[PDB]
Structures are given as C-alpha cells and as structure tokens.
Design a protein around this ligand. Structure first.
Ligand SMILES: COc1ccc(CCC[C@H](CC(=O)N(C)O)CP(=O)(O)O)cc1
Ligand SMILES: COc1ccc(CCC[C@H](CC(=O)N(C)O)CP(=O)(O)O)cc1
Ligand SMILES: [Mn+2]
Ligand SMILES: [Mn+2]
Lengths: 410, 410
C-alpha cells in the first residue's frame, strides 16, 4: 500500500487529494492516509480523521490544539498521535511509516515542510510553484545531498510534461537534477496556458482592467492570487522558470502556447522531433493522483475524455506586448542568479496591490521591472544554511523594494 | 551501431527508411545498412548500393541477377554477397550481423519475410498491416516460440500508440503477446484517421465516385491500394484489427476518430483516464525511425512542429452509413476466428475491382459482406505449419468467392 501524508489537508490541493484517494480506494485498497496536517481548521480536521483514520494528526495553531484532543475521543477504535506546530510537522516527516508527502501549503511554511521531507528522503508531491521559482538552487543542492529524496510535480502543466516522459529514462535520474533533459532525450517544451480572461483585449482596454474583471469572469474557479497571475500571465511566467528547474530545459527551448480549451495540458518535443502530449478535462485530480502512483497508474471512475464532443482544439502565440509579465519572467530566468527570487517576491506585492485596487494592470509589470533592474547579482553561497538565508534576505529585500516604489508614486 | 536490413528498399517505406538513416548518420554514425532487398528495380538498387555499401544485396527476380553483379563491379573497394529470391531473403534473415529488419513489402513476400525474421529472433519493424490482419494467429504462435523476436509497429497510428506507452512497462511484455494491454495500463484507444478524400460527400455523391476521384489531387501521395482503402475507410477497418492483435485491446475499447489535419496520429487512454497522444507533421520518417531506435531516440534535423501555425485541430465521429467498411471490419474482428483473414482477402479483390472501374463504391462493402456471411468458422490448427496452410487456404477461398460474386452480378 501507498502510505501518504497530506500537508494542508483542508486547502484546495489537500481536499482534491483526499477526494481522489477516497474514490480510488473504493475500487481497490491502494492508499493508507498516515498523516493529516492543517493550520487551524479543527472541525474539518476532525471530520477527515473520522473518515481516513490517520496514525498522525497535527495542527499548527496552538489555541485550537486541546479542542482537537477532545474531538477525536468521539472516534471509536482509534488512538492517533496528536501533535502541534512546526515540531509535529518534523516528527511526521521523520516517521518511517510515511513514504510520500503532498505539500499543499503556500509561502514559507510550504518550503519549510518540503525541506524537512527531503531531509528525511521522502517522495514529495509538490504543488507550490513559488518555492521552486524562489528557492530552486537550495532545493537542487538538498536533492544532491539526500539522494533518495524526490520531488514529483503536481502543477498541471509540469505533471503533464512528466507524464509524457519514458519512465525507463526517468528512473535513471530525477527532477531538479543536472542532465535530466539529456537523459530523457528532451529537445523542447510546449507549456500550455488557458490565456486568462484578457486575450482579446487591446492595449488601451488592458490599461483599465480591474481586479473584479479578473475575478468575476474566471474560466476555472481558483484562489485570488493565482487568478490574478492567470490574468497577467505571470502564472505562466513562473511556470517557465519552474520548467527550467524541474527538467533542466534551456529557456530558449520553452515555448508558451495559448490553448483556451484546456484539454492538452502541455507537450514535450524529443530530439527526433516527435511530440508527446497529455490530455484530459481540466481536473486537478489527475496530476495529484499521478504524483502518488508514479511510476505506475491505478484505476479511476473519472469521466472518459470524449474527443468528438470536444471537437476543436486551438493554439496561438501569446502577445508579449499585452502580457509583459511573460517577458520579465524569461529575462529573470535567463539572467539567472537570484533574479527568479526577486521576480517572485516583487510579483507577490504587485499582485496584491492590484487585487486591492491600489495600482493598474501595467503598473504590475512596471513595478516588477524596476525591482529587477535594482538587483545586483550575488555570489551564490556554497553552504546550504547560508544559501537559504541568502534566499530569504533577497525575498524580503525585493518585497520591500516593490512596496517603496509603490509608496513613492502614491 | 544498429545493423539494419531493408526489405523492399525502393518502395515507399524503404525509401523513407534510407532517407532518415542517411540524415541521422550525418549527425552521428548510428546505423549500418547491412542488407538491401528489392523485387525488380536493379538500377535503383545499384545506386543505393553505391551510397550505403551493404554487405548483402538481394533481388527477387532471377533475370536481373547477372546485371546487378556486373553493375556492382563499378563500385570501388566493395565485395558484397549478392543473392537472389526467397533463398536470398532467408540467408539475410539468418545472418548474425543483422539485428533489425524493416519489412516494406506487401502480400506473400511480406508475410514470408516476416516469418523468417521472427524464426531468426530478430527485431522486425513491420509496415505490412495486412500480414497482422490475415495471419495474426500465426504471428502470435511464432512469437510465442521465438521468445527474443519482437514486432515493432511502423504503421503510423500504431507507432503513435506505441510511442504513448511507458517503456518501463513495454519492456516487460511485447506486441502480439496476451495481456499487453493489462501490463501497460491501457483502457481505450483513439485511432486517428485522415477521413480520406470522400469524407464530406453526401450519400448521393458517394454512389457515383470513381477510383480516378480517389487518386487525383490527393492530400497525401501514396500507393493505389492504400489510397482506395483510405477512400472507403477500410484502411481504418484493417487498422482496428491490427490494433486488437498488436496491443490486445478489446474491440469495444477501440474508437475511430476523424482528424483531418493529420497532426495527432493516435491517442491512448490509461486506466486512470489520463490520455497521452503523439503528434508530428504527416511524415513516415518518424514512425520508421522510432521502430529502429526503440527503446531509445536519436537526434534528427526534421522541421520542428509549429503548433501556433497549425492553429486548429479537429475531431469527429465517422458515419458508418457512408463508410460501411468500418462496420464490416468491427463485425469480422468481434466474430474472431478467421473472419479477419476473409475480410482482408475479399477486400483485396473488391479494392482492385473498384480501382479498375469494374464495380461501384457501395459494391465494395456489398461483396465483402457477402463473402463474410458465407464463411464458416473453422477449428484453429495447433501446429504452426498447419496453421499457416489453413490461413493461406482461407485467403485463397475468400478471393475466389469475391470474384465469383462479381462474376454472378456481371
Ligand atoms: C489539470 O487540471 C486543470 C485545471 C484547470 C485548468 C485551467 C487553469 C490553468 C492555469 C491554472 C494552473 O496553473 N493550473 C491548473 O496548474 C491558469 P493559466 O495560467 O494557464 O491561465 C487546466 C487544467
Ligand atoms: C506519420 O505520417 C503520416 C503520413 C501520412 C498521413 C496521412 C494518411 C493517413 C492514412 C495512411 C496510413 O495508414 N498511414 C500514414 O499509416 C490514411 P487514413 O486511413 O487515415 O485515411 C498521416 C501521417
Ligand atoms: Mn499550472
Ligand atoms: Mn496507418
């Protein structure tokens, strides 16, 4: 059986993970949910523990910890280990009964848990793209030290790419390794994008789009931060950098393609020029499930893809004039060093300013550009602990610089 | 280095094979062309010999053997073994210096050369679909005896399917082996079709179509027999039975889909419902090359796929009223026994009659239908030589039965 821990079990990734685990387990007993970890949602955690009966429970916020002890006494034939805070998270990662960990947490806590899962040589199903973009150098170093640890991508485009690779080759290497693309015979990547709500808009219309325009008309219902990133196409920009780090693909060999139907999730061109792609209805359960079953697949009862009903698939080039965030992401990635850390941090501020109606659409890319131009390349620390501190310092500096630029103009 | 024999080196498959070998060898010395076999085309064989310098030359026609011998004296520093007929073909197949054999011949010579390749435990890159459809039981039996022989599909849709599979699983089985689909986690196949030249005709327009119409201004230039089969969609019918035999996929799990752009070459749905597809411009060099490099890939200088330029891909269900040959193929496959042998043989006659303007479009399916209805299932022979004789007997009966029906309504 596959022993799995879910970090952030009441978030979107976590709930989708538990839903597909539930459905697959009805078909055949495949998964043992060993651990659940949430921030502060005691009642939701209790209800999950009542169904999945994990050996470990953990909650971050200590003011709801004692409530969790009293609630789980209601569950018959069940004596779980009930833990708190960052210290519980570490004991879960070191537990020898856990093989795979789904990281469904954003920001620093996602990176911190990822770090501990890798230190304990686990398979890490990673759905936090910002951690790869910001701390890719640190994750690469850590994965070279902890040779049995693996990152398996959950982001849909990256899962699609991963699914297009031959496991006879993949098993000779692992994600984030130097030479991954060479071993897998990868020549080039088509990174598919929905395009967001603004593909048909003129430059003059883009000047005055609001956060309500981005959030009120979604194709896909998702969180506010990623919804804004989808609108500016900075989501895809971040995903270009994620692609480079995960698969060791040069930036000149990564192409963003707008595919509004969201059936083809991305494609891999091999060195012979044959192209392989992965397809399904938009549904995060497939990428999540593959991350937990890889290198095998298991039966599901999901609706089969009806290609004749779909009927038409379309592809076009994104306009870099209309979506300058894409260009900025390529520029940062190509310049290398900590420019991706700077890009991610400045976007975090700009995205939130736009979300709260403080700035306009082209101010987002204007602020990010100015912060990138202000950054001086730094010698990359050889020491793992110094490197993490270097990444955090640069992240903090870039957020501050973005905010000062906003304050000056305001 | 990969040591290759090409059977039918001056036909379409053979010429494409030598073209891609030449171009790949310019990039890196990968292939040794060890043997070339042709029916009659002595001058063309000489030109190929001058370039590729194979250890073996074989010509089927005894009357040009002395001519070939004399021509080859013009080639500097070159002393090939020059052979003739079925005996020369047997000698090439049994050479320890040949690893892989491309079968680019039709009809008896194709089946016979395939048989000898398998008996000598070679990798057999098979482009003759009619051999699988007509003699699938015999090939299965022979591959069970000769455990190290392998059939690798060259037919473009079947190559596409093969390229969509995980080689970590393919290497634990082989084509035409029972349980191939289970081991590879296959649920369902989308078998892509161009639709042929008559795809948008009304029933009234279909009644009148001639072979000249099928052959003129074609989307893809290919041989006359396959062009007529593409027009009736019996090409796809035969390919459904080919899919069943190569991959052990049930007929209810094979769907024919009309994809007029011919970019997606076929798709595989796995048991989790994720779908993987293979794409390129229509070009037989990719499927041929993959058959010779499998389980690896090598570099080419082929034009990269420009998805944005292609722009739109479409998919629709074929009409079984307009293309009754598809229905007849499924019926024959599902009934099993030697019904596929009968279908292939009766189509061979009906195709040729329509090609030569002797019968109309709907007479093709009428003739095939009547021969199929007349056939009575037989006990399948246990001995492999008895089985080969049984298949050849049924093939000959079905051709004669088709011709009789033609002569009765003449
Ligand atoms: C496999 O399931 C889905 C779900 C939803 C969708 C549509 C949203 C795609 C993407 C969100 C994302 O980054 N994802 C899902 O990873 C928004 P974009 O930047 O491409 O404009 C596609 C596929
Ligand atoms: C990979 O290269 C090509 C070349 C040509 C084409 C177009 C012809 C496709 C097919 C011929 C065939 O059976 N083939 C190539 O295997 C004719 P249909 O029955 O689908 O109507 C597509 C792909
Ligand atoms: Mn994504
Ligand atoms: Mn074909």
């Amino acid at each position: 059986p596959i022993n799995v821990a879910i970090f952030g079990s009441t978030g979107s990734i976590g709930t989708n993970a538990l839903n597909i685990i539930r459905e697959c387990n009805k078909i055949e007993n495949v998964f043992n949910v060993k651990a659940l970890y949430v921030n502060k949602s005691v009642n939701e955690l209790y209800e999950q523990a009542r169904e999945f009966l994990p050996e470990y429970l953990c909650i971050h916020d200590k003011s709801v910890y004692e409530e969790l002890k009293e609630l789980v006494k209601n569950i018959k034939d069940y004596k779980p280990i009930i833990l708190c805070g960052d210290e519980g998270m570490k004991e879960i990662c070191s537990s020898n009964s856990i093989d795979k960990i789904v990281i469904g947490i954003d920001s620093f806590q996602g990176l911190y848990s990822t770090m501990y899962a890798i230190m304990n040589n686990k398979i890490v199903a990673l759905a936090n793209k910002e951690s790869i973009v910001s701390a890719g150098f640190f994750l690469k170093k850590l994965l070279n030290i902890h040779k049995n640890a693996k990152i398996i991508p959950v982001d849909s485009e990256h899962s699609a790419i991963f699914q297009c690779l031959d496991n006879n080759k993949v098993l000779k290497t692992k994600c984030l390794q130097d030479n991954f693309s060479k071993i897998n015979n990868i020549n080039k990547i088509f990174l598919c994008s929905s395009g967001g709500p603004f593909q048909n808009l003129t430059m003059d219309e883009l000047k005055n789009v609001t956060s309500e325009n981005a959030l009120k008309h979604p194709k896909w219902k998702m969180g506010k931060k990623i919804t804004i990133d989808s609108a500016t196409m900075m989501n895809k920009g971040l995903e270009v950098i994620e692609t480079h780090f995960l698969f060791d693909v040069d930036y000149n060999d990564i192409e963003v393609i707008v595919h509004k139907e969201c059936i083809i999730h991305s494609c891999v061109e091999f060195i012979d020029k044959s192209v392989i792609s992965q397809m399904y209805y938009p549904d995060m359960q497939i990428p999540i499930l593959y991350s937990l079953t890889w290198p095998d697949r298991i039966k599901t009862n999901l609706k089969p893809l009806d290609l004749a009903q779909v009927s038409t698939l379309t592809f076009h080039k994104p306009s870099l004039e209309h979506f300058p965030c894409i260009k900025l992401a390529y520029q940062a990635g190509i310049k290398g060093n900590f420019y991706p850390t700077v890009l991610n941090a400045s976007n975090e501020i700009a995205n939130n300013l736009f979300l709260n109606n403080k700035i306009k659409y082209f101010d987002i890319s204007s602020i990010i550009s100015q912060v990138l131009e202000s950054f001086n390349s730094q010698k990359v620390s050889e020491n793992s602990e110094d490197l993490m501190k270097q990444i955090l310092q640069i992240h903090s500096w870039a957020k501050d610089k973005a905010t000062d630029i906003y304050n000056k103009h305001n």
